[PDB]
Paper text:
Periplasmic chaperone–subunit complexes are then recruited to the OM usher ([name] for P pili, FimD for type 1 pili) for subunit assembly into pili and secretion of the pilus fiber to the cell surface. Ushers contain five domains: a central 24-stranded ß-barrel domain that inserts into the OM to form the secretion channel, an internal plug domain that forms the channel gate, a periplasmic N-terminal domain (NTD) that functions in subunit recruitment, and two tandem periplasmic C-terminal domains (CTD1 and CTD2) that function in pilus assembly and secretion.
To generate a three-subunit intermediate, we replaced the [name] NTE with the NTE from PapE (PapKE-NTE) and deleted papE, resulting in a ∆E P pilus tip fiber composed of [name] bound to [name] bound to [name]. For the three-subunit ∆E dataset, starting with 537,038 particles, after 2D and 3D classifications, we derived one 3D map, named Conformer I at 7.6 Å. The ∆E cryo-EM structure (Conformer I) represents a P pilus assembly intermediate consisting of the [name] usher, [name] chaperone, and three polymerized pilus subunits: the [name] adhesin, with its pilin domain translocating through the [name] β-barrel channel and its lectin domain exposed on the extracellular side; and [name] and [name], which are located on the periplasmic side of the usher. In the Conformer I ∆E structure, the [name] chaperone and associated [name] subunit are held on the periplasmic side of the [name] usher by the N-terminal tail region of the usher NTD. Notably, [name] CTD2 is not resolved in the ∆E structure, indicating that this usher domain is released from the bound chaperone-tip complex and flexible. Therefore, Conformer I likely represents the stage just after a newly recruited chaperone–subunit complex (PapDK), still bound at the usher NTD, has undergone DSE with the previously recruited chaperone–subunit complex (PapDF) bound at the usher CTDs. Comparison with the ∆E Conformer I shows that as the third subunit is polymerized from below, [name] moves upward (outward) by 41 Å while rotating by 85°, which is equivalent to approximately 2° rotation per 1 Å advance. Notably, as the [name] lectin domain emerges from the usher chamber, it bends back by 60° toward the pilin domain such that the two lobes of [name] are now nearly orthogonal to each other.
Numbering used by the authors:
A (entry chain D): 1 to 215
B (entry chain G): 21 to 336
C (entry chain F): 9 to 52, 55 to 97, 115 to 148
D (entry chain C): 35 to 758
E (entry chain K): 9 to 157
Amino acid sequence: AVSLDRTRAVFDGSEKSMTLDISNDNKQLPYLAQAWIENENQEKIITGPVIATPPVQRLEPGAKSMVRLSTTPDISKLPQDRESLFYFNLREIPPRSEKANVLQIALQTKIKLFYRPAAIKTRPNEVWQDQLILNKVSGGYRIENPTPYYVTVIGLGGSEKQAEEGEFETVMLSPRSEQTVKSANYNTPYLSYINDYGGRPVLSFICNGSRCSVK
Amino acid sequence: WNNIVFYSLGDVNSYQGGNVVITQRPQFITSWRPGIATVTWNQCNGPGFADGFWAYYREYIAWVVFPKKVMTQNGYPLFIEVHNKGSWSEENTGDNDSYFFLKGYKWDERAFDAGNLCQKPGETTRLTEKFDDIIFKVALPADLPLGDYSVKIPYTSGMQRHFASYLGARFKIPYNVAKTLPRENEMLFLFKNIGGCRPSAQSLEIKHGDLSINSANNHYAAQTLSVSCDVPANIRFMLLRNTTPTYSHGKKFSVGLGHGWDSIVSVNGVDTGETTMRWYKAGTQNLTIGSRLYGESSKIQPGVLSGSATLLMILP
Amino acid sequence: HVYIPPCTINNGQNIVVDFGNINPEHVDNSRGEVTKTISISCPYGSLWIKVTGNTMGGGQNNVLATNITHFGIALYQGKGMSTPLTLRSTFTFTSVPFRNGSGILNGGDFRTTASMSMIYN
Amino acid sequence: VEFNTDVLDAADKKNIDFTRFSEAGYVLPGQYLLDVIVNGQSISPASLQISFVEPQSSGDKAEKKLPQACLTSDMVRLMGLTAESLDKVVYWHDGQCADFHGLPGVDIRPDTGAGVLRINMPQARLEYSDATWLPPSRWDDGIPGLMLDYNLNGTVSRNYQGGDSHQFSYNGTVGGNLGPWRLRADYQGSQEQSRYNGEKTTNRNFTWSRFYLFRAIPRWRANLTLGENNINSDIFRSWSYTGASLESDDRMLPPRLRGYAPQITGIAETNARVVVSQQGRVLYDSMVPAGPFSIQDLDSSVRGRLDVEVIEQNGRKKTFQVDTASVPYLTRPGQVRYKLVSGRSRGYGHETEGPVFATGEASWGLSNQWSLYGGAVLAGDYNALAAGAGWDLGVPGTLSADITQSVARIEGERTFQGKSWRLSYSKRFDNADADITFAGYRFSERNYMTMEQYLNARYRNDYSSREKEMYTVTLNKNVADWNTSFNLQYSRQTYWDIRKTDYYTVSVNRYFNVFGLQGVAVGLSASRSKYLGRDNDSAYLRISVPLGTGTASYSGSMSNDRYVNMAGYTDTFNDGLDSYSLNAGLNSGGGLTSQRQINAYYSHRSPLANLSANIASLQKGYTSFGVSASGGATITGKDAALHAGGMSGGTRLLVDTDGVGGVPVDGGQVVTNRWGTGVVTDISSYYRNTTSVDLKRLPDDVEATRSVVESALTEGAIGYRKFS
Amino acid sequence: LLDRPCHVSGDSLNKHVVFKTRASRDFWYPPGRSPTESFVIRLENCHATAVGKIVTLTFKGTEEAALPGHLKVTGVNAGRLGIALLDTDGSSLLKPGTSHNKGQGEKVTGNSLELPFGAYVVATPEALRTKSVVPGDYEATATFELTYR
């Protein structure tokens, strides 16, 4: 299996390249980690702003290897005041069988990458979600973002247990825009969100009428 | 039989030494005066009186013994050496607390004289005998302060008589009983010093800060000393040995610091220990005592350095 | 002597435990203990190693603190997790994260400072 | 194994033909940040980036390419590869692949996953280049600048009578390097500054001891020194000279090949690896090839025996013992050591001349533990030709000989012929650890002479004291559970027709602990100068018991009516900014004179300049209050600096910055001053020195990004290291 | 292992079952049916009610113009044979590019989660009425994509 070291990919605009180690856990048959890049609107793109080092590379069983990503001038010519979304993928292919009617099983793990520019770079201890405003709408809730960073809400509850246990559809939202997600009415909302590395904290809010602020 | 009767001299003389510097040698004459004498040691196992009716032969051996080393009021020794031999017969130079004078000039004479063979210690007599003088030079040490001095050298000058019973009896007095004689003679001589050659430091301390042992090799530790005088001489430098050298490095005079860690001592660049420098005019010379602590035979030994280096100035 | 000598520490290099990038939430019975072998150059042993630093609450005495909560880095001597070390030749110590509790974790990338006090005889 | 080509990752053709490599380690191009290693050890930190392009120039029918790292010229200039023996690395353009198939035995493993790329090469034309001792191919020379290093003193002399005066012993060793050549000149000798009273001394001293110019030659491995210098005590006695001197120093070679040791022989059949431990420490472990193997990597600081066992591909091992000599002048077989001095002879003063000088000395090491040496003095009126050999017999001991015919003619009609001999003996580690490290048999005739007789007056009144047969055994025995190395020495100086003087001593250093911590070293000795009268003895007693912040010690000796003792109770403290000492004592001048005395010390090593204070005394209870300061400065370089530890004038690096107030450098704790330059001087020679930043004691105004950096001083050179 | 949640482990890495098919007995009579086989895939460190919060699985592949909703087969029967993948309930067909329904069918066995998958071959009706199926070796590729939030 293609073991991915951490749950997200983060790369700096002032740096030229960074390394991410991969490691296969198989014991007998070798696999190859091939890497390619697609954009936001799911079209294949070999040119563009991100140039990929390893498109096809193989690793022996019980070993480890890496994937480094670097820059083209198209990353310079896009706006540096907000993030952009694109994605790099890696799949393992097993060896083919000589027999007829063979269904080959290939697996891949999908993790997103966010581009942080040097001008709006964050320090590692920064809790940047300490400024979000909450607005009561009838029938659901509207996600509004005054920051240029991405916001994905998969949870809203009256406690911690209903926020992590309750069924809620995953949605992605672009910066400085809005969209409506259906939910019930709660007095003191506790919101779930995802950080850069995969930890699970919870935020506490206080509501003043119909507009709420972070406690 | 061999009975020994001792009788020591009783003279007191004075002399003015004048103005001296430390490397020059003031000559002094030790004149002999045939004066009064006092008997101090008697032993009787034979007869006491004799009327002179038997044939009796006599012998004579003189004894003037002065120490080379002498205690002063301030505690430093005077290393005095013998300048000339003359018409003497030198024997037993291996002693360090006493030199020894002996003189045989008359032998094979039989007497017909009546006298006192075993004498009591309480008598004084008449003395008339003229012989050659002695010449004396005083070597000043390395350290001496200025001013006036009244140094007293204790010396026992005497004249004994040897009487035995058979012809061809050559017998000498043993050394362990000869040094037990009392302090009879004194000499009131005076000296004046304005100050000659003396080192200004007189401490010789070697210390510094701290660093690791990986850079302890090819080290440097120097301390200089200035020597000043006003008389043209030929000075000689000698470093006296106090400790033991751990490992053999050949002909190099190394000063041990303890625990198997010695140190090479380089006097003004040349690693020799002893040097030779002469004087030219007024001014001063210097002795830079540098030291390399390279004594490691691939084994480190942590121990506190508390050595020493005693200096002394031998003059030729 | 008068000289209290420092021998050496990994021939004048910087000491950094390269762990790659792994998450602080793991099972406390087997983990990614990256083995580090540090040599010390002696001139000719008479040496003991003391590691100090800030610690967290409880009765455990083998973890140095970080700049953010719910994750620490634990140290043990030699190959094998049997004997831990109380907080020419060589000495081996491995740094591995150890966790005894669940809950909220705020922060994932880290850097640590470990002070090794070398007292000579 | 074969794989599935029909998975179709990209709908458009990526056209990099992804089906042929199904069974050579092809990493397709991009860039990496790994470091570089040769035969297991590292060279530089992981900051360099060497790229790799594919060999499209190779026109074949099989169409297979292998990505090798296209190494650029500057990193191969610092990798440790020689440039004069292999002229194949000099003709490639940077765009193509610099091939490695021309030299034999090199296989490349370009592993981008672990990132280390291990490469083996044969042991005949390599620079090993480990943790210390950088190769001579990459050198940063010194910047044009002047430098000084002082050590001041000064005291008060209070006596019971006469008067008072002061002393100011200020010396000085200036040095200026403009490019490679540096002048080491001593501008100050010794001085004096007195107080005013009724009796004046007022003597101003001046002399100049040694002026010389020197620079190391890395091609023929020597260091020529022109000016005032000194020769070692190999065969002849030492005297200061003036002129050139091509002397092979010991500091220019690596520390693990430092010293003399016999090489090991043997026949191998496969690639084995020799690992050896004397009593518990592994020193060298590497692979050695087949055939008549003879590795010359280390002849280090180990006295004797070691068990050479080889382990080949299956595991059987053979062992055999080798013997060592450990005589003070043996050399490495196959290498040259020489002393070629020329110029003119010096006298007593600085302005004293003499005859023309030319003295040659060399050494030659042949195989199977054979060695030659020889002195050749070619002059107009003095010819002393020396020749000798050295032998290692093994178990009974080692031998050496010295044949030397010295013929010369003095101008006062005196024909001079003379024959001298010398034998050297040694012994290896027995069961009771008895070792005779040196045993001389220097034999001199009635007509041997040194150069010192003609430069002085015609009357000399001394021939020499070292006239006839000598024997000097120096046994050192160590017994277990006591940690005692007791040593005895017996010397023999000779006279003619008057009594002989015989020096012989016995010393013992035992180790025990009574009511205290471990670390107590206590010594006892017995020395005695023999002749027929006055058996003069000499015995010293010294005990040292530490308590961490104190060391109780009494070092008393007694030769003849002179007994002393001490009462020291000081050591160093916790953080290290200052150091103190204090001692008591009592002397004995023979004639009932015994009174107290006091010696103390008061230092503080400030990072601008280290300084001390000293109160001392002597016999008749004096008082000498002093103040001493040391360190140096580097005036008129690119910028000025002042430091505090220097062994001579040189061997130190100066780290530079801009706009800082003060930052301490580790290993000596020197902070920078107001213009911001710091220089550490308590370091060694010919090693890879690294200087870092202290993270636990920095102020909150500056930030250090690049900590680790490298430098290169041979001796007397100043580095150049800027950090941001 | 607690690192990388909802991951495929080292024991269940290579699943391979060989289809026992013959053209004249299964793709010749109109009902186009052969026996259906079961597929087992377990996801370690993933929770039952928390499945939609972390991972959603969608099938990737090229769409067929004459038969919507199945996987591409190549060889001598390109466009003639189809592979229909079964859901956990065994009845609903999951089109390539459409996401998996969270809920029913999952088995919480310990700290892992069992997902019973299916794999099945379906013949083309135009090829069934015209009997154009030729016996021989058939090759196809499959790639399951897990979309992590």
